[PDB]
Design an enzyme around this catalytic site. Structure first.
Site, PDB file in Angstrom:
ATOM      1  N   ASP A  16       2.015   9.963  11.858  1.00  0.00           N
ATOM      2  CA  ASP A  16       3.278  10.541  11.406  1.00  0.00           C
ATOM      3  C   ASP A  16       3.807  11.722  12.159  1.00  0.00           C
ATOM      4  O   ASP A  16       3.773  12.845  11.631  1.00  0.00           O
ATOM      5  CB  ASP A  16       3.199  10.983   9.939  1.00  0.00           C
ATOM      6  CG  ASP A  16       2.662   9.917   9.053  1.00  0.00           C
ATOM      7  OD1 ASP A  16       3.174   8.781   9.167  1.00  0.00           O
ATOM      8  OD2 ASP A  16       1.747  10.201   8.239  1.00  0.00           O
TER       9      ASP A  16
ATOM     10  N   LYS B  14       4.719  -2.043   8.449  1.00  0.00           N
ATOM     11  CA  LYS B  14       5.822  -1.316   7.816  1.00  0.00           C
ATOM     12  C   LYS B  14       7.151  -1.989   8.052  1.00  0.00           C
ATOM     13  O   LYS B  14       7.535  -2.236   9.201  1.00  0.00           O
ATOM     14  CB  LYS B  14       5.906   0.134   8.321  1.00  0.00           C
ATOM     15  CG  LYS B  14       7.126   0.893   7.759  1.00  0.00           C
ATOM     16  CD  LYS B  14       7.057   2.397   7.988  1.00  0.00           C
ATOM     17  CE  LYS B  14       7.232   2.770   9.458  1.00  0.00           C
ATOM     18  NZ  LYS B  14       7.250   4.254   9.674  1.00  0.00           N
TER      19      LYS B  14
ATOM     20  N   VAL C 238       0.833  -1.196   0.000  1.00  0.00           N
ATOM     21  CA  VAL C 238       0.000   0.000   0.000  1.00  0.00           C
ATOM     22  C   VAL C 238       0.876   1.258   0.000  1.00  0.00           C
ATOM     23  O   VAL C 238       0.381   2.377   0.182  1.00  0.00           O
ATOM     24  CB  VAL C 238      -0.943   0.072   1.222  1.00  0.00           C
ATOM     25  CG1 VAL C 238      -1.989  -1.013   1.134  1.00  0.00           C
ATOM     26  CG2 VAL C 238      -0.144  -0.025   2.517  1.00  0.00           C
ATOM     27  N   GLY C 239       2.183   1.076  -0.195  1.00  0.00           N
ATOM     28  CA  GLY C 239       3.078   2.224  -0.198  1.00  0.00           C
ATOM     29  C   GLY C 239       4.511   1.852   0.127  1.00  0.00           C
ATOM     30  O   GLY C 239       4.721   0.748   0.668  1.00  0.00           O
TER      31      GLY C 239
ATOM     32  N   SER D 235       8.864   0.044   3.499  1.00  0.00           N
ATOM     33  CA  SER D 235       7.567   0.126   2.778  1.00  0.00           C
ATOM     34  C   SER D 235       6.451  -0.479   3.628  1.00  0.00           C
ATOM     35  O   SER D 235       6.709  -1.076   4.687  1.00  0.00           O
ATOM     36  CB  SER D 235       7.669  -0.586   1.434  1.00  0.00           C
ATOM     37  OG  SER D 235       8.257  -1.860   1.601  1.00  0.00           O
ATOM     38  N   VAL D 236       5.216  -0.334   3.157  1.00  0.00           N
ATOM     39  CA  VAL D 236       4.058  -0.805   3.911  1.00  0.00           C
ATOM     40  C   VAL D 236       3.065  -1.737   3.211  1.00  0.00           C
ATOM     41  O   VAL D 236       2.769  -1.578   2.026  1.00  0.00           O
ATOM     42  CB  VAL D 236       3.263   0.406   4.446  1.00  0.00           C
ATOM     43  CG1 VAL D 236       2.104  -0.066   5.328  1.00  0.00           C
ATOM     44  CG2 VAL D 236       4.203   1.349   5.199  1.00  0.00           C
TER      45      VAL D 236
HETATM   46  C1  LIG Z   1      -2.404   5.571  -3.826  1.00  0.00           C
HETATM   47  C2  LIG Z   1      -1.608   4.592  -2.949  1.00  0.00           C
HETATM   48  N1  LIG Z   1      -2.494   3.850  -2.021  1.00  0.00           N
HETATM   49  C3  LIG Z   1      -2.462   2.396  -2.328  1.00  0.00           C
HETATM   50  C4  LIG Z   1      -3.862   1.851  -2.645  1.00  0.00           C
HETATM   51  C5  LIG Z   1      -2.065   4.127  -0.630  1.00  0.00           C
HETATM   52  O1  LIG Z   1      -3.165   4.564   0.180  1.00  0.00           O
HETATM   53  C6  LIG Z   1      -3.308   4.204   1.509  1.00  0.00           C
HETATM   54  C7  LIG Z   1      -2.351   3.358   2.174  1.00  0.00           C
HETATM   55  C8  LIG Z   1      -2.545   3.019   3.523  1.00  0.00           C
HETATM   56  C9  LIG Z   1      -3.692   3.519   4.232  1.00  0.00           C
HETATM   57  N2  LIG Z   1      -3.931   3.191   5.638  1.00  0.00           N
HETATM   58  C10 LIG Z   1      -2.916   3.192   6.667  1.00  0.00           C
HETATM   59  N3  LIG Z   1      -3.282   2.923   7.983  1.00  0.00           N
HETATM   60  C11 LIG Z   1      -2.348   2.925   8.938  1.00  0.00           C
HETATM   61  C12 LIG Z   1      -0.954   3.202   8.619  1.00  0.00           C
HETATM   62  C13 LIG Z   1      -0.679   3.472   7.201  1.00  0.00           C
HETATM   63  N4  LIG Z   1      -1.658   3.457   6.278  1.00  0.00           N
HETATM   64  N5  LIG Z   1       0.657   3.746   6.794  1.00  0.00           N
HETATM   65  C14 LIG Z   1       0.952   4.021   5.361  1.00  0.00           C
HETATM   66  C15 LIG Z   1       1.760   3.763   7.745  1.00  0.00           C
HETATM   67  O2  LIG Z   1       2.948   3.996   7.400  1.00  0.00           O
HETATM   68  N6  LIG Z   1       1.438   3.481   9.161  1.00  0.00           N
HETATM   69  C16 LIG Z   1       2.471   3.427  10.124  1.00  0.00           C
HETATM   70  C17 LIG Z   1       2.968   4.622  10.824  1.00  0.00           C
HETATM   71 CL1  LIG Z   1       2.295   6.181  10.512  1.00  0.00          CL
HETATM   72  C18 LIG Z   1       4.010   4.483  11.772  1.00  0.00           C
HETATM   73  C19 LIG Z   1       4.584   3.199  12.051  1.00  0.00           C
HETATM   74  C20 LIG Z   1       4.122   2.027  11.386  1.00  0.00           C
HETATM   75  C21 LIG Z   1       3.076   2.110  10.425  1.00  0.00           C
HETATM   76 CL2  LIG Z   1       2.517   0.668   9.622  1.00  0.00          CL
HETATM   77  C22 LIG Z   1       0.079   3.208   9.576  1.00  0.00           C
HETATM   78  C23 LIG Z   1      -4.650   4.365   3.581  1.00  0.00           C
HETATM   79  C24 LIG Z   1      -4.457   4.709   2.214  1.00  0.00           C
END
Ligand SMILES: CCN(CC)COc1ccc(Nc2ncc3c(n2)N(C)C(=O)N(c2c(Cl)cccc2Cl)C3)cc1
Length: 340
Positions: A159, A44, A26-27, A28-29
């Site tokens: 963030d 992540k 979804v984005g 690494s994640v």
């Molecule tokens: C156009 C690209 N699209 C793909 C379809 C991406 O759109 C998104 C992708 C994810 C989300 N939800 C989402 N919920 C929770 C976290 C998170 N993204 N992310 C990205 C983190 O990094 N999180 C996090 C932090 Cl802030 C600190 C430590 C650990 C983590 Cl996992 C939480 C909503 C829309």
């Protein structure tokens, strides 16, 4: 020690405990489903966590922060793990949090929200912020894109605190920043976050960016036009003689009438806005005081707005080697205890 399984996700190898299934980038994640809790989660995998002092300390910093935050309106840690079996083999860090739907920016941009809607969202931001500030932590980068909210309109602050290039020009990365921090006027406080909240609140009320400056100086002009040029009192607090000096070259302007700027808005919203958007950070309303403001009468509950336990960040003042930051990070990983 759980059993881990490997999977390549876009030229990236992920090794995670079996409990996490259906990983998709979804984005690494990656989003995944935690079969042990029944929760949709975001996972992540840190990129080169210990490649430099700056990176190793950054990794430690992020882990310490997330492990500390335990509040409904703040992103917390559901899990942290490494496939490593010992400190010598330790190289990767994975952080697990609740999966959020979309960020405020991707949801209501260019859109005016109803007043009841604004009350609810801002109230939650302030509730989270009261918790964060109570720990002597400053977000420093609040923006609509760092606020996630589900269907029921439930919000989480994400963030916590940047490339100078990304702060240049017509960019949302700087539009919500307090003037004293944007131009480095002085050692700043936690009310830098309140200024951000005011910028966000106004945008939710109008559907328009409050101070969409084309650059740092254009933005300062937009701000001073609304709140007025600084008086003698605030000038003295600006440690920078050059900054102080630039300020004084400007034609003086009086503060504008907020009711004439946010036309039609709830008078209580207008009043709170004036208290958050005060140029002198010593005079801005704090998160705790704001929660008590009549604008939130419908949501305010002094018994349901908790504060955080103390947060020791003496480590910020330390200069350690990569191996030392790495070892401290490892201890934080293995000492992790999941929330109920
Ligand atoms: C156009 C690209 N699209 C793909 C379809 C991406 O759109 C998104 C992708 C994810 C989300 N939800 C989402 N919920 C929770 C976290 C998170 N993204 N992310 C990205 C983190 O990094 N999180 C996090 C932090 Cl802030 C600190 C430590 C650990 C983590 Cl996992 C939480 C909503 C829309």
């Amino acid at each position: 020690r759980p059993t881990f399984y490997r999977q390549e996700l876009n030229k990236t190898i992920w090794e995670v405990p079996e409990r996490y299934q259906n990983l998709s980038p979804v984005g690494s994640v990656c989003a995944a489903f935690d079969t042990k809790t029944g929760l949709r989660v975001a996972v992540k995998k840190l990129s080169r966590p210990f490649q430099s002092i700056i990176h190793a300390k950054r990794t430690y910093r992020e882990l310490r922060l997330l492990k500390h935050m335990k509040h409904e309106n703040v992103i917390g840690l559901l899990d942290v793990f490494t496939p490593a079996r010992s400190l010598e083999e330790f190289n990767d860090v994975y952080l697990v949090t609740h999966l959020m739907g979309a960020d405020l920016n991707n949801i209501v941009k260019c859109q005016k929200l109803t007043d009841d809607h604004v009350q609810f969202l801002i109230y939650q931001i302030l509730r989270g912020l009261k918790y964060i500030h109570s720990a002597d932590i400053i977000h420093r980068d609040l923006k609509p894109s760092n606020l996630a909210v589900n269907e029921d309109c439930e919000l989480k602050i994400l963030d916590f605190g940047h490339t100078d290039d990304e702060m240049t020009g017509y960019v949302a990365t700087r539009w919500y920043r307090a003037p004293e921090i944007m131009l480095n006027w002085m050692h700043y406080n936690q009310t830098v976050d309140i200024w951000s909240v005011g910028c966000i609140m106004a945008e939710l009320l109008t559907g328009r960016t409050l101070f969409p400056g084309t650059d740092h100086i254009d933005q300062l002009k937009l701000i001073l036009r609304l709140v007025g040029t600084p008086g003698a009192e605030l000038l003295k607090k600006i440690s920078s003689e050059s900054a102080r000096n630039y300020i004084q070259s400007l034609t003086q302007m009086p503060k504008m009438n907020f009711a004439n700027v946010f036309i039609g808005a709830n008078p209580l919203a207008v009043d709170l806005l004036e208290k958050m958007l005060v140029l002198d950070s010593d005079k801005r309303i704090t998160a705790a005081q704001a929660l008590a403001h009549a604008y939130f009468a419908q949501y305010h509950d002094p018994d349901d707005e908790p504060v955080a336990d103390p947060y020791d960040q003496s480590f910020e003042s330390r200069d350690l080697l990569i191996d030392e930051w790495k070892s401290l990070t490892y201890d934080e990983v293995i000492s992790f205890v999941p929330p109920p």
